UniProtKB/Swiss-Prot annotation, chain A:
Native species: Escherichia coli (strain K12)
EC number: 2.7.7.6
Annotated consequence of substituting residue 765 to T/V: Resistant to antibiotics salinamide A and B
One Gene Ontology molecular-function label: DNA binding
Chain's gene name: rpoC
Outcome recorded upon mutating residue 721 to T: Resistant to antibiotics salinamide A and B
Known partners and oligomeric status: The RNAP catalytic core consists of 2 alpha, 1 beta, 1 beta' and 1 omega subunit. When a sigma factor is associated with the core the holoenzyme is formed, which can initiate transcription. The rRNA transcription and antitermination complex (rrnTAC) consists of RNAP, NusA, NusB, NusE (rpsJ), NusG, SubB, ribosomal protein S4, DNA and precursor rRNA; S4 is more flexible than other subunits.
Biotechnology remark: Co-administration of salinamide and rifampicin or salinamide and myxopyronin suppresses the emergence of resistance to both antibiotics.
Record annotation: effect of changing residue 683 to V: Resistant to antibiotics salinamide A and B
Reactions the enzyme catalyzes: RNA(n) + a ribonucleoside 5'-triphosphate = RNA(n+1) + diphosphate
The name this protein goes by in its record: DNA-directed RNA polymerase subunit beta'
From Swiss-Prot, chain B:
PANTHER family registered for this protein in UniProt: RNA POLYMERASE SIGMA FACTOR RPO, RNA POLYMERASE SIGMA FACTOR RPOD
Protein name: RNA polymerase sigma factor RpoD
Annotated positions for site Interaction with anti-sigma factors: 380
Residue ranges, annotated region (Sigma-70 factor domain-2): 197-267
Record remark on domains: Contains 4 domains, connected by flexible linkers. In the active conformation, the domains are in an extended conformation, each making extensive interactions with the RNA polymerase catalytic core. In the autoinhibited state, sigma-70 factor domain-1 packs closely together with sigma-70 factor domains-2 and -4, contrary to the extended conformation that is seen when the protein is part of the RNA polymerase holoenzyme.
NCBIfam families (alphabetical): PRK05658.1, RpoD_Cterm, sigma70-ECF
GO molecular function per UniProt: DNA binding; sigma factor activity
Superkingdom field: Bacteria
Positions of short motif Interaction with polymerase core subunit RpoC: 221-224
Keyword field: Cytoplasm, DNA-binding, Sigma factor, Transcription, Transcription regulation
Region (Sigma-70 factor domain-3): 276-352
Ranges annotated as DNA-binding: 391-410
Gene Ontology cellular component terms for the protein in this record: cytosol; cytosolic DNA-directed RNA polymerase complex; sigma factor antagonist complex
Length: 1344, 431
């Protein structure tokens, strides 16, 4: 009953007989008149159990006197019926048959054991050729294929020592005879001599299989079937449909034909038939077994009677609609209901309206119980009749039952954890569920036909955790980012905007009021307007040093509306919150302030009161939308006519041939874009601030009260682009795929489009609509993969005690600051404090949570880089400590022990997926004033007094007065600079200049130039020009170089009059400027070149969407990867082979030379021996994460993935905390590979869990011995999720047959750690509430 | 050249294509050789006398008509018995295997061959030789092994068992071995002969089968069953009749194929005769439909088949075959018939609770009754105890009087009918 683990292994024939209760000999199912089962058929009562409870066929042994006693005459045992669901049978095959899973499922385990190619086993099994089991005589050997006539040739001669067989008997005889130990040792030896990489790895994997296969206790013989088990009847039922017909499962058919073929084979062998006939029967039996175990994998699927293939056992397990996903991970549920939703604005934040009928049905048994308690019904049947007739006492009882009982409301798809929330019910009439307006944003629900489902929690624990963990008043902050989710919206915002805004002289200027109550009394009596500018006496409260509320009274300048609103605001907040015209942002900020100052309860009450007031005053405003409200600029037609005439003249000018197609097209597009912008700006100018009012005298100008403008400003529903379409021009459109149509749409929706313009717009309309429709599925698949990778993460410890971290800086891409620190460090734990004695005397204590206060301190001291403890570096095994995580964003404190991080991270990343979509490079110009600080720069002065850079990686910054970086840039190689380091540059200045379509080799010195190892005709080409006669020398590469001029490497000697080269001080390098191929020197040999002149001119002439992030997380390799410098030292070319570019790095100090092949057509950035370090980029192109991890280290790859994922989300304005991406990366670096002989049982080339290696290594290092050396591997989402230490998790995920085969062969054992595992087996998950329970069981391991 | 044609049908046809047909001469040639092998084995069987003794004794024990000799049986076997008995004496006369005794044995076999024997007795006779052959071989393999490995030409010690084997058998080992190996050679010739016709006529089987293949079991099952039939036909064929082989073989092949297609091919196994009747029904319906131009009503169909209306109706309802649980009932291939079917065996939680409440209430009411009355009622109806004990057992246990138990039950019924006690039980009124 109670268990601890699940193990899988192969089944020996005697085991299969052990399961059995009897063997099935006839294919009959049931009798055609009396539908009782047949004697030994597939449904026999004797072997599978009795059909009807406690009654055998004859009934002589009855009345529960005989328990377990078998009635002999009818052979029917007298027990319960449920046994037909669990007893199994068996079938004894006449000829051994191969198990398809262990034969075809690649890499074909049978092939690995015997080391035979698959097609050879195929040809043996299908009786097409013989195989030699035992050649005692030296002529032949084992596993040699023998053709038909060749066997005759060998038999007739030799005979009597020659064992050859054919078919599955042969394969089983081969497996039975083969001794594992011998090959284990022999292959162990064989790897020790020669390691051809391919041969080495195949031998490693085969040795792995043999060693595991010996350990598990399996024997290879068992891969081939002799006894075959038969599934219990009630899992393949044959049931009578009401109409007299019968419904059956397909397994009945497959079993029947296996039995038929087997019986006929026995008959044939008994009858001494010719051999071709028995061979035929043997093949058909083998085929029937294959179709039973897995249909269609043997090529041709057996179709049923109808048209369609029969569905077999493997089909019952595998698919999206197999057992694992459809009946175990998620299942249909009692006590539940469903209906349409509707808005109830009178509700409080923790209530939901439930129809009377649904409530009466859901809570049925509770009602029965309390009807019996009060004595109103004697028995349960009376209670039924009381309920079905709906007597009044039933309604009283129901009202008493539902009170304090929460229910769960769900709306599919459930993208994130806020899609399920618990509410307290209020009974209503009608049939629609009433939902509180504020929670619609979380649900993503709109009231236009949606439906939601209702579930009832039953036990006391379920009720309590609905009230404590899930109640809607507990979820006000989002767990993805810290921002609140209760955010007032359309009507609320409109009401608050209208109530707060101010107007000129309208009723009641300059009165003086004794507080808000007089303001309300004035407004509602019609004596003043909501917009009057009035002077009101107001008392704020302010929280003291020790939390006391000091009261301060003053006389403020405000309006009537703001005074009335102030009555809602809880005491503790400043008046300045209310004293400006509130938009959407202002209201959300108001709620956030109230939360972080006062707590939870005041914010809940405040949020309600905001909603109520907003509705009330929005209604009283009476805002409406007429057609006169969409004003059109008086000068639109002038702009349109001017643009049309100008385009007409440019098109007329085209036919003079002055303008090509590209010129005309680009010019026309530019013209129309400019016209569009002018029209839009004129429309907004006329619309936004157009009201002229007399201020008791002359005229005044104020923002307008136009209703569409109100909906724009308030942020209620409109935007600028929509209004542009309503009143300006609709704009330019695009052809179906890329091209942008030439003539725009000049009309707007008030004016009305014509036929052709409407047809044009339809293209884009349909394209966008189909995009969303077919993008939802990709979003769903991505989030499923993410959830499955990182589910095992739970907070397990309190402090791993690690000293690692990630250094974090604000992101300064390009010119402007994308993200400050306070957004990027808030709520994380600082490790290895950064102190700055000196300018700032920076004190950051160890291990602190960065509150808002600490962040404010950081800002005022203005620090830029902070090292922060991070999940990817945590040292805990099988989890992460609380400290390395940080805040729990939804709650607001250090995260609690036992919470499921991984699911939260996967959900928060995958949720925004649906809304996510699908050259003046001359010089460097500083935007704002500051000071220049270069880093990693190799400079050389020229004669012009300009700084020339040769360093490959040169970075430009802008330090401000307080010492922060405001800009950063990448200085290209060989770019001329303007100013040196140290001086303050000015805004707008250009600091660098280089040739865009060229990489020039810049001179440092002067003198005479000698053209070395470069002959004309062999290396260069003569170029002759006209009368001017200017020639240019162009170096030809070895591709077209003649055979005689191949060893000539072009170079430029820089000699003086004597020829002697002065050596660089201190350094012994010879001045040998061997410029590589195609060093194009236009100036001929013997021409004086100035320092800083161009020697050669070699010219140098993005998915970004949902696929981009899917590829980032899957760790795919870009097609053209940049190459990185592995080892520091000297760099050179070597001897080319067939054109294989030969790259030799010999280390300056290291002795071993490292060689890299390079593709021919790829260019090389570096010329010759430089000081290139670990992972120094040498080619141009996208970078591969694998290389980043191997060379730079783990922190580098984390930073890379975080940044380039976050770009995709920032571009759409989606805010996600980086912590979740860090978690996924942690789960994605799980494995390591071993390169060493340690002290433990590891090997070359094994892949094992990093945690396992850490445990073994620390265990040995506690004993002196030296452990093995490892290197972490980076695996995609799918790989890493399929390689866990648990076959149930992987098997439920994907690729069921493969993982089940591997686990079965290796004899794995599942220890039930994850969440999916316990969910499947029906247990408490090890997270949250269940956590404590498991830890008790853990200490039970101490007493066992 | 094999393009990995995994299709078993291709492998079968490729294998069968090699053997080439031969007609009008081979069939006679192979039939002659088969009969020659059978005659050889019959002659050599008749050579062994103890088999004749055993068969004659078995005939005498048991006690079938019209023997093909080119109280009838008893009078025809009387003179054969007399001849055999007088031949035994001559074998005892001055020569164990004397030429005269051999000639008498030959004439006895010639007369014996003129009779007809049931094949099962022939097999029994062959096994009567096989058993003793195996016994003698088994008891002596060890002595041959030892003489070969140790002696290389104990001896007298091992000779005792060999002599005992001769005494038990009572005949020369050499003649026994001769007859046994002659059995083997004759049977081998017969078997190896029949293989040739069987491998020759596989194409005939293919044709006859494909005439039936139209959506029945499957092609290969039909082919294999036909091959069984062909083996039977080769057994039964006689060239003496002078007919072509195909004429005879086709009947057996059709019979085998049709009988199998009747036995198998349905989940619920309709017997053969019903299958024949359904086939008649369908053949009549087509013709009658084209004659009338519409579908036939069951009454008119009953008129044409000369069968009562109810019989026809019963056949029509029996005919239909079960429907697969995976048939997609939804237009979109997402939902299958299987999800749509309800489980009937289960009881309802409501009724379970009701039953428990009923048991409790009955116990409460019974506890209030008189102790002996309560235990009597429990004892009578088997309440709370595993089985119910009858009136006699209750009488012999408590009080021998039978009618006293009747009066006890009458009074108990009277008491519990009193309206006070029954009030709760009325709630279980509708059931
Ligand atoms: Mg909707
Ligand atoms: Zn019985
Ligand atoms: Zn940690």
């Amino acid at each position: 009953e109670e268990f601890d683990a699940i193990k899988i292994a192969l089944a020996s024939p005697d085991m299969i007989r052990s399961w059995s209760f009897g063997e099935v000999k006839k294919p009959e199912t049931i009798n055609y008149r009396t539908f009782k089962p047949e004697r030994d058929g597939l449904f026999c009562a004797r072997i599978f159990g009795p059909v009807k409870d406690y009654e055998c066929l004859c009934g002589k042994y009855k009345r529960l006197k005989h328990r377990g006693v078998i009635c002999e005459k009818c052979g029917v045992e007298v027990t319960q019926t449920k046994v037909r669901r669990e007893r199994m049978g068996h079938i004894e095959l006449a000829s051994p048959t191969a198990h398809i899973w262990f034969l075809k499922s690649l890499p074909s385990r049978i092939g690995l054991l015997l080391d035979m190619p698959l097609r050879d086993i195929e040809r043996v099994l299908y009786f097409e050729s013989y195989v030699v089991i035992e050649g005692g005589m030296t002529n032949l050997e084992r596993q040699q294929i023998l053709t038909e006539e060749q066997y005759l040739d060998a038999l007739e001669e030799f005979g009597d020592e020659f064992d050859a067989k054919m078919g599955a008997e042969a394969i089983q005889a081969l497996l039975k005879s083969m001794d594992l130990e011998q090959e284990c040792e022999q292959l162990r030896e064989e790897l020790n001599e020669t390691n051809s990489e391919t041969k080495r790895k195949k031998l490693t994997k085969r040795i792995k299989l043999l060693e595991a296969f010996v350990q598990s206790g399996n024997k290879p013989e068992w891969m081939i079937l002799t006894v075959l088990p038969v599934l219990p009847p009630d899992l393949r039922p044959l049931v009578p449909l009401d109409g007299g017909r019968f419904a059956t499962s397909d397994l009945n058919d497959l079993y029947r034909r296996v039995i038929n073929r087997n019986n006929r084979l026995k008959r044939l062998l008994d009858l001494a038939a010719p051999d071709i006939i028995v061979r035929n029967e043997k093949r058909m039996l083998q085929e029937a077994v294959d179709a039973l175990l897995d249909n269609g994998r043997r090529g041709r699927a057996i179709t049923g009677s109808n048209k369609r293939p029969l569905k077999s056992l493997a089909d019952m397990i595998k698919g999206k609609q197999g057992r694992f996903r459809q009946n175990l991970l998620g299942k249909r549920v009692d006590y539940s209901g469903r209906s349409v939703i509707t808005v109830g604005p009178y509700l409080r934040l923790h209530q939901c309206g439930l129809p009377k009928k649904m409530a009466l049905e859901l809570f049925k048994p509770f009602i029965y119980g309390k009807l019996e308690l009060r004595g109103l019904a004697t028995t349960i049947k009376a209670a039924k009749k009381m309920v079905e007739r709906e007597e009044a006492v039933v309604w009283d009882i129901l009202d008493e039952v539902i009170r304090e009982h929460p229910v769960l409301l769900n709306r599919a798809p459930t993208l994130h954890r806020l899609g399920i929330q618990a509410f307290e019910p209020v009974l209503i009439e009608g049939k629609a569920i009433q939902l509180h307006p504020l929670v619609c944003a979380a649900y993503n629900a709109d009231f236009d036909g949606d439906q939601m489902a209702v579930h009832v929690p039953l036990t006391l624990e379920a009720q309590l955790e609905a009230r404590a963990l899930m109640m809607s008043t507990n979820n006000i902050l989002s767990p993805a980012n810290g921002e609140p989710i209760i955010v007032p919206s359309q009507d609320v915002v409109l009401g608050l905007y209208y109530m707060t805004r101010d107007c000129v002289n309208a009723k009641g200027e300059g009165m003086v009021l004794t507080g808000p109550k007089e303001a309300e009394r004035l407004y509602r009596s019609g004596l003043a307007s909501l917009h009057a500018r009035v002077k009101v006496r107001i008392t704020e409260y302010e929280k003291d040093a020790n939390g006391e509320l000091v009261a301060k009274t003053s006389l403020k300048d405000t309006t009537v509306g703001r005074a009335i609103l102030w009555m809602i605001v809880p005491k503790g907040l400043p008046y300045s919150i209310v004293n400006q015209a509130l938009g959407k942002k202002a209201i959300s900020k108001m709620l956030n302030t109230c939360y972080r100052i006062l707590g939870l309860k005041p914010t809940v009450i405040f949020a309600d009161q905001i909603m109520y007031t907003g509705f009330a005053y929005a209604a009283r405003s009476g805002a409406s939308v007429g057609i006169d409200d969409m004003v059109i600029p008086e000068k639109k037609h002038e702009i349109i006519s001017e643009a049309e005439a100008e385009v007409a003249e440019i098109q007329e000018q085209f036919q003079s041939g002055l303008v090509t197609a590209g010129e005309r097209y680009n010019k026309v597009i530019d013209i129309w874009a400019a016209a569009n912008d002018r029209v839009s700006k004129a429309m907004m100018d006329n619309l936004q601030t157009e009201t002229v009012i007399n201020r008791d005298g002359q005229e005044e100008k104020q923002v307008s009260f136009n209703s569409i403008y109100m909906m724009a400003d308030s942020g209620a529903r409109g935007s600028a682009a929509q209004i542009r379409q309503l009143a300006g021009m609709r704009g330019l459109m695009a052809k179906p795929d890329g091209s942008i149509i030439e003539t725009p749409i000049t009309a707007n929706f008030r004016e009305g489009l014509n036929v052709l313009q409407y047809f044009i717009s339809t293209h884009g309309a349909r394209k966008g609509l189909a995009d969303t429709a077919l993008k939802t599925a990709n979003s769903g698949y991505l989030t499923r993969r993410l959830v499955d990778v990182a589910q095992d993460l739970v907070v397990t410890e309190d402090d791993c005690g690690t000293h690692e971290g990630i250094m974090m800086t604000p992101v300064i891409e390009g010119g402007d600051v994308k993200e400050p620190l306070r957004d990027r460090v808030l709520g994380r734990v600082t490790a290895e404090d950064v102190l700055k004695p000196g300018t700032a005397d920076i004190l950051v204590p160890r291990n602190t949570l960065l509150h808002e206060q600490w962040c404010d301190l950081l800002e005022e001291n203005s620090v830029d880089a902070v090292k922060v403890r991070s999940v990817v570096s945590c040292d805990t095994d099988f989890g992460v400590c609380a400290h390395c995580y940080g805040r729990d964003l939804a709650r607001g404190h250090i995260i609690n022990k036992g919470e499921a991080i991984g699911v939260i991270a996967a959900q928060s990343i995958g949720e925004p997926g649906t809304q996510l979509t699908m050259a003046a490079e001359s010089s460097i110009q500083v935007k704002n004033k500051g000071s220049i600080k270069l880093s990693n720069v190799k400079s050389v002065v020229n004669s012009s007094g300009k700084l020339v850079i040769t360093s490959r990686n040169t970075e430009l910054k802008l330090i401000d007065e307080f010492g922060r970086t405001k800009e950063s840039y990448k200085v290209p190689y060989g770019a001329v600079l303007a100013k040196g380091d140290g001086e303050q540059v000015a805004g707008g200045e250009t600091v660098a200049n280089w040739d865009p379509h060229t990489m020039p080799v810049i001179t440092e010195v002067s003198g005479f130039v000698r053209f070395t190892d470069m002959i004309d005709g062999q290396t260069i080409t003569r170029q002759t020009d006209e009368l001017t006669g200017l020639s240019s020398l162009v170096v030809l590469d070895s591709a077209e170089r003649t055979a005689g001029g191949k060893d000539l490497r072009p170079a430029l000697k820089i000699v003086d009059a004597q020829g002697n080269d002065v050596l660089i001080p201190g350094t012994d390098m010879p001045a040998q400027y061997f410029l590589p191929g195609k060093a194009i020197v236009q100036l001929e040999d013997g021409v004086q070149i100035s320092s800083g002149d161009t020697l050669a001119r070699i010219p140098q002439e993005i998915t970004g969407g949902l696929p981009r992030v899917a590829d980032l997380f899957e760790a795919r390799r870009p097609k053209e990867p940049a190459i990185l410098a592995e080892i520091s030292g000297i760099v050179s070319f070597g001897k080319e082979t067939k054109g294989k570019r030969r790259l030799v790095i010999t280390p300056v100090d290291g002795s071993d030379p490292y060689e890299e092949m390079i593709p021919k057509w790829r260019q090389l950035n570096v010329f010759e021996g430089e000081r290139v370090e670990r992972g120094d980029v040498i080619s141009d192109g996208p970078e591969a994460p694998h290389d980043i991890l191997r060379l730079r280290g783990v922190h580098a790859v984390t930073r890379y993935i975080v940044n380039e994922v976050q770009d995709v989300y920032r571009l759409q304005g989606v805010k996600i905390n980086d912590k979740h991406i860090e978690v996924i990366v942690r789960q994605m670096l799980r494995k390591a590979t071993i390169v060493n002989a340690g002290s433990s049982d590891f090997l070359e080339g094994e892949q094992v869990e990093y945690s396992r290696v850490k445990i073994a290594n620390r265990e040995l290092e506690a004993n002196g011995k030296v452990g093995a050396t490892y290197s972490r591997d980076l695996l995609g989402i799918t790989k890493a999720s399929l390689a866990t230490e648990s076959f149930i998790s992987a098997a439920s995920f994907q690729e069921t047959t493969r993982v089940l085969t591997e686990a079965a062969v290796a004899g794995k054992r599942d220890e039930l750690r994850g969440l999916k595992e316990n969910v499947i087996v029906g247990r408490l998950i090890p997270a949250g509430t269940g956590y404590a329970y498991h830890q008790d069981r853990m200490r039970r391991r101490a007493a066992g | 050249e094999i393009g990995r044609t995994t299709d078993p049908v291709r492998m079968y046809m490729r294998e069968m294509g090699t053997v080439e047909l031969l007609t009008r001469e081979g069939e006679i040639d192979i039939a002659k050789r088969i009969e020659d092998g059978i005659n050889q084995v019959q002659c050599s069987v008749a050579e062994y006398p103890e088999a004749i003794t055993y068969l004659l004794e078995q005939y005498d024990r048991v006690e079938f008509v019209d023997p093909n000799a080119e109280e009838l049986a008893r009078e025809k076997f009387a003179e054969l018995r007399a001849q055999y008995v007088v031949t035994r004496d001559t074998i005892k006369a001055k020569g164990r295997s004397h030429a005269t005794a051999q000639e008498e044995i030959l004439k006895l076999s010639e007369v014996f061959k003129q009779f007809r024997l049931v094949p099962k007795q022939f097999d029994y006779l062959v096994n009567s030789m096989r058993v003793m052959m195996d016994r003698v071989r088994t008891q002596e393999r060890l002595i041959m092994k030892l003489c070969v490995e140790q002696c290389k030409m104990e001896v007298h010690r091992a000779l005792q068992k060999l002599q005992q084997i001769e005494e038990e058998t009572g005949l020369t080992i050499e003649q026994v071995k001769d007859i046994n190996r002659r059995m083997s050679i004759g049977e081998a010739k017969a078997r190896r002969a029949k293989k040739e016709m069987v491998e020759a006529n596989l194409r005939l089987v293919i044709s006859i089968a494909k005439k039936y293949t139209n959506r029945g079991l499957q092609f290969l099952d039909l082919i294999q069953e036909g091959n069984i039939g062909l083996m039977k036909a080769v057994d039964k064929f006689e060239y003496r009749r002078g007919y072509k082989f195909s004429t005879y073989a086709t009947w057996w092949i059709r019979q085998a194929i049709t009988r199998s297609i009747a036995d198998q091919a349905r989940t619920i196994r309709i017997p053969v005769h019903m299958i024949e009747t359904i086939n008649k029904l369908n053949r009549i319906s087509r013709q009658m439909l084209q004659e009338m131009g519409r579908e036939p009503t069951p009454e008119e169909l009953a008129e044409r088949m000369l069968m009562p209306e109810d019989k026809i109706r019963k056949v029509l309802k029996i005919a239909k075959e079960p429907i697969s649980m995976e048939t997609p009932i939804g237009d979109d291939e997402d939902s299958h018939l299987g999800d749509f079917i309800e489980d009937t065996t289960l009881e309802l939680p409501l009724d379970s609770a009701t039953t428990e409440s009923l048991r409790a209430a009955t116990h409460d009411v019974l506890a209030g009754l008189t102790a002996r009355e309560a235990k009597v009622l429990r004892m009578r109806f088997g309440i709370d105890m595993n089985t119910d004990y009858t009136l006699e057992e209750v009488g012999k246990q408590f009080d021998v009087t039978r009618e006293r138990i009747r009066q006890i039950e009458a009074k108990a019924l009277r008491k519990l009918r009193h309206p006070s006690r029954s009030e709760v039980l009325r709630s279980f009124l509708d059931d």
